[PDB]
Amino acid sequence: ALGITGGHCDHNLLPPEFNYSSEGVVDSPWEARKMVRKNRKYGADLIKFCATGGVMSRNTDVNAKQFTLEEMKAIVDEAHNHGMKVAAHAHGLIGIKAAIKAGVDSVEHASFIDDETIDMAIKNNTVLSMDIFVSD
Amino acid sequence: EDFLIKSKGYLDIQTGEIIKADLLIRNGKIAEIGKINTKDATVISIPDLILIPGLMDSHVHIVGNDSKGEESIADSSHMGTVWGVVNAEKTLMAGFTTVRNVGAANYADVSVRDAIERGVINGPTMLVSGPALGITGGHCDHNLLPPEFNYSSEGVVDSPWEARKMVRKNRKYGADLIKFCATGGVMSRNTDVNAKQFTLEEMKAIVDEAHNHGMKVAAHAHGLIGIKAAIKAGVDSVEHASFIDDETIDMAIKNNTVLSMDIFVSDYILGEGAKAGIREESLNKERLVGKKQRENFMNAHRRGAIITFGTDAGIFDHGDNAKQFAYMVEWGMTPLEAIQASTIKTATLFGIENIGQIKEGFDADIVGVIENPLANIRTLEEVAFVMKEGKVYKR
Amino acid sequence: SEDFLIKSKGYLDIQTGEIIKADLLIRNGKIAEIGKINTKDATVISIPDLILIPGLMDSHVHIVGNDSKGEESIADSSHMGTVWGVVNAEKTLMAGFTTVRNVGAANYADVSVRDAIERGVINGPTMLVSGPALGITGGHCDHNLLPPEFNYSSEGVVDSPWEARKMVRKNRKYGADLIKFCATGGVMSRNTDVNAKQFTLEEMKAIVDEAHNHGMKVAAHAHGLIGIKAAIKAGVDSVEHASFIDDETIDMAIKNNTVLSMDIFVSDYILGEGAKAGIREESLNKERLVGKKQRENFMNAHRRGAIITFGTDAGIFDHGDNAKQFAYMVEWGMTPLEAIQASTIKTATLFGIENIGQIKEGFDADIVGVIENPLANIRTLEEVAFVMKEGKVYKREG
Amino acid sequence: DFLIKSKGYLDIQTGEIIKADLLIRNGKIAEIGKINTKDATVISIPDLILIPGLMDSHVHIVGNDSKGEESIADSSHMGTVWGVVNAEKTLMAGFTTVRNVGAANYADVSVRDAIERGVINGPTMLVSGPALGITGGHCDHNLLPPEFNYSSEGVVDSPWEARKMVRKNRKYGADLIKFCATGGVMSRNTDVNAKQFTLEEMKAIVDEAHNHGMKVAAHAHGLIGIKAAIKAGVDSVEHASFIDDETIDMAIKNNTVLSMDIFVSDYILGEGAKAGIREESLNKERLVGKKQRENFMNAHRRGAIITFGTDAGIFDHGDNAKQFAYMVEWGMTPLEAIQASTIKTATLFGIENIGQIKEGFDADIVGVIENPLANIRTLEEVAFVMKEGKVYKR
Ligand SMILES: NC(=[NH2+])NCCC[C@H](N)C(=O)O
Ligand SMILES: NC(=[NH2+])NCCC[C@H](N)C(=O)O
Ligand SMILES: NC(=[NH2+])NCCC[C@H](N)C(=O)O
Ligand SMILES: NC(=[NH2+])NCCC[C@H](N)C(=O)O
């Protein structure tokens, strides 16, 4: 999964002395581009990125957008260029909005989606992939 | 644990009026204002001491090496953390309950903040910045080594995406807050104080990314072009702000850019600091900056700009933060407005609500003082009672 | 000028056992005179019912390290270990320990805390520090808590004689007083055989020769017998723990002036109030192997005539509670006088420091004052009432 | 609890098969004798002879078994997926404790621990980590151009480097140390009759592993490397292909086991030739194969300990018992061949309480149709597998 430094799909479990980032951590449009290429190269069928923070990660904010829209658009263009679909992890609303705008194929979780951006997903044929059991 | 505080009176920091009433404290918050019934737990008889909210400093460097001389040259970064423990206690006993740390290395600032937060040690509630962000060779670079070492400091960033990433890295590792340098400085080697550092594009990228995570942004800036650009980039405070003029005071007003103007510390640097360790290149830049800053501090206050209590403690001794109160009133603030700048005005800037007022529901940060501070403000230099978050630290 | 006259119930002579009624003159951080002193300018410590002994010592502490627990503590930096170190140094002082041997830490932050004590930045005992402990790859003072993908060895991992040479030199360069190595496996580490020697003798003899070349002392961690034998043969100044020492190698230790720093309290913490408090079950099973056998061998060590010092492995248990071992030391077969001797003059000789560990003329003013007589009840060392270090008073109750 | 009613069990010490019943509680043989009393449940077998669970002292369970064009850029994780398959295949063939003798990335220890924890089915593995070797050796990867400068994990080239890698293998969970002491068949660019490692390097490995209580196996075809492995003091020499009269006697005196694989040559030169094995390897097999099982016969005759080791991985996992026929063919009694795969291996592995149907020993029990002392080829199709008191095959 592609993420920002310290994102949901980074690994924020080590002291800063280790300087660990996970395999898919990317922090520019062209880095993000390259990671889509690297995933395709080694055989991936789709691209996942993290667009907000999440529940299971340390030190992430669920309502904070992760990635600029510029980075998000780069991930989506490059993946669609190779005929890959794009899923985007997004709990908070500003992330959901931004993922849809970038042109993602599915938004994962989609937890705080409002009326106006439900309709954004309808209009763009964006799918909501929503895990409503797992909270229990 | 419950506390009834028997005061000479509390300052109402909104109105000015001091109010003779009692305060009930339960679990780190002010419960009651008025005359209170008293059934369970303990009384603090104070009665000679007029009560004010816990004070704030918006520009400190609590963590750093304060050992000096020949013995201290090969000292590891951990000596700076030892001193961090010391200076935090010293800052709390001076009646400062919530501060904004504005540069450290190695996330030792978050180490000292969290230890206070866990009750491992005593100190103020630190808002910490992590490594400050600079251009190669800037003010918050370290320009003290030969080119053969090729040493750059932790926050050195040189493109918008590099800067984006360091904001993220600082968020990852605990920072509350991004500080960056937008001009050259006084205390650094090889920096022009009137030169802009960072492109506008670099600056905007820092701000955009930090605000995206709900982090506030502070910019170090003396020179005018730097101040303008920082304001234009959309920062939450300009630090120092030394050569601010009529037009860009106005730019700051329309944007809600706080000015964090350290008007004491020039007198320490040009006075006691000349033999205390401070380089001659640094003293020459302080002559350029010092007088003109408080001239412009007076102008900014007159024109209506928001100014908060930041001192650059760490240059001068921690504990002596309160010495700036007298300077603040000397250069145009009323005594009320000087205390407002370390209570209600910092609290907005810090982004923390429920501090800095003696109001019901607010956090029990309270400092007891000898005289009437609206008459003599230099009482804040000699405090007799410190409560932070319900617990009593000084009596 | 700024001198102290201490008026007390008595002072212990640590060579004899005698409690002597005398006053003490303190100048320039030293005990100047003992007896009746004519003075009119010196300020008087009136401390009339307190018995005085010299400042206590610990030959095995870990003052610096993170003592924060739970889920919030996980990505904490190394500087949180230094913040805790400050707290723990103060806590060790207030329990009447005035010179200690800090026997393993990371990043030379042990030398920082030490130096900041030396400079009077913070209150604490005089630490003698090791630096990073030298270990083999995957040894007890390696860190085996990470997947092989990380390929993390800790700071002091060495695997050849000339590598071990180089780490002794590096430790010294960054300010260390002594060298600790692990010679066997250990209780508190993951995947270490307590009964297996770690290091070759060649590597052990290289560590020792270099450390002694620079006038540094060597401690060796060794539970298992083969590693005790090898440490002694290499020429170490102390074997730490020494848990499965036998008759023949007690005799070796006597012969070569090898000290035995035997932490005999701490097994009651780990199995008791430590199994509840987050010690892993792999460690506890190794603790069951060690603890009772160490105390039996502690008794046999003393009676056969080996030098034992007072080490606790504090840091495992709470700093400040070091003196709980004193009870455990009369239990397992020292006289109360020998117990304090182990924490004063016997430690001083191990430490290589002259002019501490006695209330004597010319010696440093490291002086602990106590409520009951410690030769009658040793367990009042667990609640001291007066602490003086280097002329300065740090604890006084009444 | 379990009660096993049986045609009889092999007493592997005496050779005489004993008609009795076996009581299994807590994964051990509790009672041998006549019982059918109390607790839990009978196992209705009747017609099967019982033997102690079979052991292989030279396997390679983890590794990619996919072939051809698809498999070329496969990650190391494919070899781990295959390890899960190959563990079951080994266990269902009646092999209950095995020695895995060289994998990469510590995937062997993973596969082991997964079996131990009950995540997956398989035998108890003792694992080596990466095999130690010189640069360019048999257990170096000799298949990439110079510009890559690739060397595999266990490449060491000094005594102290070797020491360190033993320590690294221990650290990440290895039970034993394999090293390569000559060149090999299945590698590119190795001479089978040339020693690899100095004696001083070999002694450094042996001394360091024995210090941690780890057994040492040394790969050796050529004679001069077999000699030097024994003098180093290894616990086994694998293959042992060109061992002579004089240094068989060295192996008897020093109690060095010879883990000789005498089946696999016939796979390599037959079905393996068209399976994608290189001509350089096939040529080196023709140097080794015939003379190995000749020297097997001489080693057994002179009094040397030989264990059952097969080099499975080359052939398909689960076909391991095909070697048993070859071992009687080349000089052993059928008892001696099962002795080689039970009590001889248990001593080599350093594990007490397996390899025997005796009281207090672990419940590793395999049921077979015919008498194995009659025809040994019954072990090629076992009917009943029990490992640690759990029944895996019926
Ligand atoms: N309410 C929920 N769907 N919770 C589960 C969210 C799981 C997701 N991987 C996350 O950590 O954000
Ligand atoms: N007039 C002043 N505020 N002087 C102090 C400036 C301190 C600042 N950190 C700098 O070096 O630039
Ligand atoms: N019984 C004892 N001495 N227990 C404490 C042992 C502490 C030592 N660091 C170890 O893990 O080996
Ligand atoms: N005759 C034999 N045992 N042949 C098989 C040898 C296989 C061994 N792994 C090697 O490459 O050398």
Tab-separated table of C-alpha atoms in Angstrom, chain B residues 224-352:
chain	number	residue	atom	x	y	z
B	224	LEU	CA	11.142	42.414	5.962
B	225	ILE	CA	11.035	40.303	2.770
B	226	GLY	CA	11.035	37.129	4.887
B	227	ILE	CA	8.226	38.422	7.127
B	228	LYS	CA	6.129	39.373	4.073
B	229	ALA	CA	6.658	35.964	2.461
B	230	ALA	CA	5.871	34.052	5.674
B	231	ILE	CA	2.638	36.022	6.099
B	232	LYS	CA	1.882	35.452	2.389
B	233	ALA	CA	2.538	31.706	2.845
B	234	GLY	CA	-0.060	31.703	5.620
B	235	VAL	CA	1.838	31.074	8.859
B	236	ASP	CA	0.200	31.229	12.264
B	237	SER	CA	3.025	33.250	13.820
B	238	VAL	CA	6.034	35.243	12.672
B	239	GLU	CA	8.745	34.909	15.339
B	240	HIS	CA	10.923	37.951	16.140
B	241	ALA	CA	9.347	40.035	13.316
B	242	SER	CA	12.068	42.633	13.773
B	243	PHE	CA	11.832	44.781	10.634
B	244	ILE	CA	8.038	44.710	10.229
B	245	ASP	CA	6.667	47.904	8.640
B	246	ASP	CA	3.294	49.674	8.208
B	247	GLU	CA	2.089	47.677	5.173
B	248	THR	CA	2.876	44.235	6.547
B	249	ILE	CA	1.645	44.840	10.040
B	250	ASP	CA	-1.570	45.402	8.034
B	251	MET	CA	-0.988	42.146	6.108
B	252	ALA	CA	-0.635	40.365	9.467
B	253	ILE	CA	-3.856	41.941	10.802
B	254	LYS	CA	-6.086	40.772	7.928
B	255	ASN	CA	-4.665	37.237	8.146
B	256	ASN	CA	-4.625	36.707	11.938
B	257	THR	CA	-0.846	36.291	11.896
B	258	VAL	CA	0.388	36.525	15.484
B	259	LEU	CA	3.653	38.403	16.060
B	260	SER	CA	5.959	36.729	18.593
B	261	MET	CA	8.351	39.547	19.428
B	262	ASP	CA	11.155	38.937	21.929
B	263	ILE	CA	11.953	42.434	23.184
B	264	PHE	CA	13.824	41.639	26.410
B	265	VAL	CA	16.585	39.433	25.112
B	266	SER	CA	18.647	42.000	23.151
B	267	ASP	CA	19.623	43.545	26.510
B	268	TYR	CA	20.911	40.164	27.697
B	269	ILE	CA	22.854	39.556	24.461
B	270	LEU	CA	24.441	43.018	24.152
B	271	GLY	CA	24.876	43.154	27.957
B	272	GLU	CA	25.629	39.967	29.906
B	273	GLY	CA	25.965	37.716	26.849
B	274	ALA	CA	29.081	39.336	25.355
B	275	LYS	CA	31.413	37.439	27.721
B	276	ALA	CA	28.998	34.534	28.341
B	277	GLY	CA	29.833	32.856	25.013
B	278	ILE	CA	28.217	34.889	22.228
B	279	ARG	CA	30.254	35.432	19.040
B	280	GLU	CA	31.173	38.889	17.716
B	281	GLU	CA	29.367	38.246	14.403
B	282	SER	CA	26.247	37.542	16.491
B	283	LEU	CA	26.750	40.748	18.519
B	284	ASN	CA	27.017	42.794	15.300
B	285	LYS	CA	23.683	41.416	14.069
B	286	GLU	CA	22.063	42.134	17.447
B	287	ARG	CA	23.069	45.801	17.081
B	288	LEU	CA	21.262	45.772	13.700
B	289	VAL	CA	18.096	44.168	15.066
B	290	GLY	CA	17.616	44.926	18.765
B	291	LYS	CA	16.596	48.603	18.970
B	292	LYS	CA	14.528	48.501	15.770
B	293	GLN	CA	12.450	45.492	16.931
B	294	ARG	CA	10.873	47.206	19.957
B	295	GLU	CA	10.360	50.342	17.860
B	296	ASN	CA	8.333	48.105	15.514
B	297	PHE	CA	6.724	46.214	18.426
B	298	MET	CA	5.319	49.576	19.553
B	299	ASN	CA	4.098	50.300	16.007
B	300	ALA	CA	2.411	46.912	15.559
B	301	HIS	CA	0.529	47.213	18.852
B	302	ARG	CA	-0.564	50.740	17.871
B	303	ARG	CA	-1.893	49.549	14.503
B	304	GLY	CA	-3.731	46.662	16.155
B	305	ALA	CA	-1.755	43.472	15.529
B	306	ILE	CA	-1.907	40.416	17.810
B	307	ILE	CA	1.316	40.077	19.813
B	308	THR	CA	2.132	37.181	22.152
B	309	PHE	CA	4.653	36.608	24.926
B	310	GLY	CA	7.663	34.891	23.383
B	311	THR	CA	11.085	35.428	24.936
B	312	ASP	CA	13.651	33.147	23.285
B	313	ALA	CA	14.442	31.567	26.663
B	314	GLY	CA	17.519	29.400	26.294
B	315	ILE	CA	19.620	32.383	25.324
B	316	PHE	CA	18.980	33.869	28.759
B	317	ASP	CA	18.459	31.570	31.766
B	318	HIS	CA	15.208	29.597	32.000
B	319	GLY	CA	13.191	30.963	34.905
B	320	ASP	CA	14.005	34.553	33.977
B	321	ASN	CA	11.263	34.572	31.292
B	322	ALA	CA	9.097	37.011	33.264
B	323	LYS	CA	11.624	39.870	32.939
B	324	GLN	CA	10.001	40.729	29.569
B	325	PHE	CA	6.749	41.887	31.210
B	326	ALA	CA	8.359	45.215	32.207
B	327	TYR	CA	9.719	45.607	28.652
B	328	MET	CA	6.280	44.916	27.199
B	329	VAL	CA	4.689	47.778	29.153
B	330	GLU	CA	7.668	50.079	28.498
B	331	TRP	CA	7.104	49.701	24.761
B	332	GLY	CA	3.393	50.350	24.621
B	333	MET	CA	1.225	47.647	26.220
B	334	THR	CA	-0.883	48.311	29.311
B	335	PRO	CA	-0.043	45.882	32.165
B	336	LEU	CA	-3.298	44.020	31.434
B	337	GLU	CA	-2.364	43.644	27.739
B	338	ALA	CA	1.031	42.211	28.709
B	339	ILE	CA	-0.589	39.492	30.856
B	340	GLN	CA	-3.250	38.930	28.172
B	341	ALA	CA	-0.333	38.194	25.817
B	342	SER	CA	0.846	35.285	28.025
B	343	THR	CA	-2.603	33.912	28.817
B	344	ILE	CA	-5.528	34.431	26.420
B	345	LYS	CA	-3.498	35.437	23.374
B	346	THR	CA	-1.033	32.562	23.544
B	347	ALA	CA	-3.874	30.073	24.172
B	348	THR	CA	-5.508	30.920	20.838
B	349	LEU	CA	-2.106	30.713	19.084
B	350	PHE	CA	-1.258	27.385	20.745
B	351	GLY	CA	-4.683	26.139	19.616
B	352	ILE	CA	-5.536	24.905	23.111
